[PDB]
Structures are given as C-alpha cells and as structure tokens.
C-alpha cells in the first residue's frame, strides 16, 4: 500500500525518502496511523497536500507520509448558511469552482489555487485580503482531526477543544490529520473585482500610502515592489487594491453570467517610466480572478515586521538592496489583526516576499536576515522556510512553548513527525 518516494517541497530543495500512502479510503488512513502508533517510536507520520509548501513541513525522511489529495469529496455546499463541508484533500481551485454558482467566495486565497484545505489550515494561509479577512484559520467553523490515539476528534474554534483546534491551525500537521472541515464562505454576487491602481516612487511613499487610511476602503490590497534600486527609488511599488464587484458594477456584456469561473529600447528610459506610471494608475477597473489575483534555483524568503517598527522595516529593505543579491518578484502588503493560533504566521505589520537566485554567500546572508527579522520582532513563515534554526524560530514565536504543550497532550508518543519538526525542534 505504501511507496518509497523521493519527496521535496516546492523549492525542490532538501530531499528525503518516505513511504507515501495514497488512498481515497479514510479507513486505511486510520489503520495506517494506528500501525505507526503500534510500532513504538519510529519516525512517525505526516500528512501532505499538493506539495506547494516550499519547505520541509510535508516530508518525513525515513518515516511515513500520507498523501491526502485522493480525499477530495465535496460533501455539501449551502448558500443560506454559507457553509461548505469538504474533505481535507479538496483544493481551493476545485472548491472555488464548486462554490461560485451558490454566490460563495473562498474567503482566503493564496497566490496559487493548487493548495489543499488541509494545507490551508495547517499553514494558516493568508492572502491579499488579510487586513480585512484574517487568515484561513479565521473561517474554519469545524474540523475532524485524526489524532495519535486513532480516534477522530470534532473540533470547533469556541467551546471545549478550542485549544487543540487553535493548535491545529498553523500546526503544520503536527496535531494529526485533518480529514474534513466545514468552512464559512464569503457571500458574493459576482466572480469579479473592481480595482484601483497606484504607483509610488519611493519606499517612504509606499509606506505613507499604507498609513493614510486608504487601506480601510479596500478589502484586497498588495503591491509589487522594487528591491533592487538604490534609495530613494528603493521600495517604489505598483499597488493594486480593490473589492469584489456587485452585478450593477459589471459592464453589460458580463451581467448575464456574473459568476462565470475564470524588453525594448525604451524600456529603461524615461518613456517607459511614463508608461509604467500610466499603466499602473487607474480607477474602477473591473478584473476577473486571473487579471487581479494571479497577475503573473531560487530561495523564497518571506517575513513580517510589526506595524510600529516602520524605521526597522525600512532598514531591513536597505540591507537587502545593498546585499548584492537581487530579487525581482517582490510582493508587499500590510497585514491586519492576528488570530489566536499560537503558531499562526501573520501579525499586524509589514509583510514582504522576496525571491533570491541561489548564489555564493546567500545562505549566510539570509541567516543574517533571520537575525534582523528576529531582533525587529518579526517572524518567518514555515510554508516558505527550509533553513532557519530552531533557536531563531522559537524566539520568533514566543507562544511556541504554549503550542508545544498542546501537542504533547495530543501526541504523547510523537506519532506525528516531519523533517521540519525535527529541524525546528517542535517534535
Ligand atoms: C506559487 C506559490 C504561491 C504561494 N502563495 C502563497 C500566499 O500568497 N499565501 C500563503 O499563505 N501561502 C502561499 N503559498 C504557500 C501555500 O499556500 C502553503 O504552503 C500551503 O500550505 C500549501 O498547501 P498544500 O496542500 O500543498 O500543503 P503541503 O505543502 O502538501 O503541506 C503544507 C503543510 O500542511 C500540512 N498538511 C497538509 N495536509 C494536511 C492534512 N490533511 N491534515 C493535517 N495537516 C496537513 C503538511 O503536513 C505541511 O505541514 C504559496 C505557494 C506557492 C508554491
Ligand atoms: N509572498 O510570496 C506573497 C504575499 C502575498 C500577500 F498576500 F501577502 F499579499 C501574496 C502573494 C501572491 O498573491 N502571489 C505570489 N506569487 C509568488 C509566485 C508567483 C505567483 C504568485 O509569482 C510569479 C510566479 C509565476 O509565481 S507571492 C505572494
């Protein structure tokens, strides 16, 4: 039933060999776990979704990895309660297409639709609407968790078992296997966005745009920013903000199916600077999911710095541009309020995603970035991380001990284990 497979995260780095189970039969998954629990210690088990996490949180070298993608039954969708009851292996793309005809919108979407509900919960994923909607965990009304004792537990965010529910959110698989969840969806009357585009010339302008109160007018906000140019250019951005459109805001051609699923010589001169300002500046543009949300040998790096530490954030950015490591795909956003999950990554503050080409000295440079992020009160994201230390991680998440204590109640014999758990000492 299990196949010895060579696994890696999305970054295609740090491989380890695991016996991978792949079954639609929930019963065989249950017996598998009990089989891991019976054989004493061993290197335990971990669930895996679509493998989109860049790090080592869904591989388990020398142990068992359970592939959850064949558990992809959508059980029910209800437009009146706005609830969706789905297996953990359903992906958000499948969920998005199933839910649209009910006037229901997946409440948190990440940069790719190929992620499982299970993965979305376990990494407590965020998106472009974090400042208005929180993260994925905020919208989960219930989940069924297969715990180390072989029993399936029904968890809810309030009432008893709350502690365990909030340990599972952003718990990277380490409380057990989410089999099934109920999600509350966002009502919508269209599959479209209405978007305002703003272009800044400086980091200080980017920050001001995000501090002037304009952010409250928009449910979705993000920006591509310059991580390469010298200041004051550094941190100039193409900002894209907006909301889901209502049917009366759609052009006529689109009002009958409102919920339809869907370099040159001038380039571095002043004429292109002008083109770039023009084409990035607009009001009330209607856009489908792709145009607005997916507008598009590397090391993905993501951090958030708390809101108040704006000087510190600016400094980190400068260290990056003077580093001699050049990143082109840079996404910036201001996160809103955090949730109660002790290992949830997002906090209110300045979030950035960069992508460095693997080069001589990068490894030791990002270690130095880790220290700055730590010192400035931020954290890195397990979904993006393959290489930080246990000591850095623990200090970045001061509620880790509180989280560890919950995991020890639910998994006393350390039945659930991963490459990340051992590296980050969450085992
Ligand atoms: C191109 C790209 C863009 C991205 N953009 C964003 C973004 O904008 N925002 C964001 O937050 N993230 C983003 N991500 C990261 C991605 O959203 C998360 O890594 C997500 O957790 C991946 O889902 P997955 O199903 O592939 O899970 P995997 O990568 O297979 O697993 C991730 C973690 O979830 C756990 N897990 C999976 N299934 C279960 C289950 N059934 N029960 C318990 N635990 C489980 C795993 O054990 C592992 O710890 C991006 C990734 C890529 C490749
Ligand atoms: N950081 O990676 C990041 C943060 C956010 C936000 F929610 F915090 F704002 C959003 C976000 C995103 O929407 N997309 C990202 N992509 C990274 C990789 C990608 C697709 C989208 O970019 C080009 C390449 C083809 O794939 S990251 C991101």
Numbering used by the authors: 7 to 268, 284 to 317, 331 to 461
Which sentences did the original study use to describe this structure?
DprE1 is the first of two enzymes that catalyze the conversion of decaprenylphosphoryl-β-D-ribose (DPR) to decaprenylphosphoryl-β-D-arabinose (DPA). In its natural context, DprE1 catalyzes the oxidation of the 2′ hydroxyl group of DPR to give the ketone decaprenylphosphoryl-2-keto-β-D-erythropentofuranose (DPX), with flavin adenine dinucleotide (FAD) acting as the oxidant in the reaction. After BTZs have entered the catalytic pocket of DprE1 containing the reduced form of the flavin cofactor (FADH2), which was generated by oxidation of the substrate, the nitro group of the BTZs is reduced to nitroso which can then form a covalent bond with a nearby cysteine residue (Cys387, Mtb enzyme numbering). We obtained co-crystal structures of Mtb-DprE1 with BTZ compounds 1, 2, 9, and 12 and BOZ compound 5.
Compounds 12 (BTZ0434) and 13 (PBTZ16914) are the most potent BTZs reported to date and 13 in particular shows great promise for further development. The nitroso derivative does not need to be activated for covalent binding to Cys387, yet the time dependence of the inhibition is much slower than that of the nitro counterpart. Unbiased difference density maps, calculated with phases from structure models prior to incorporation of the ligand, demonstrated that all five compounds formed a covalent bond with the active site cysteine (Cys387). The complexes with BTZ and BOZ inhibitors induce partial ordering of the 315–330 loop in some cases (compounds 1, 2 and 12). In fact, in the structure of DprE1 bound to 12, some very weak density (below 1.0 sigma of the mean) can be discerned for residues 318 to 322. This weak density fails to define the conformation of the backbone sufficiently well to justify including residues 318–322 in the model. Still, this weak density indicates that, beyond residue 317, residues in the disordered loop do not contact the BTZ inhibitors in the covalent complex.
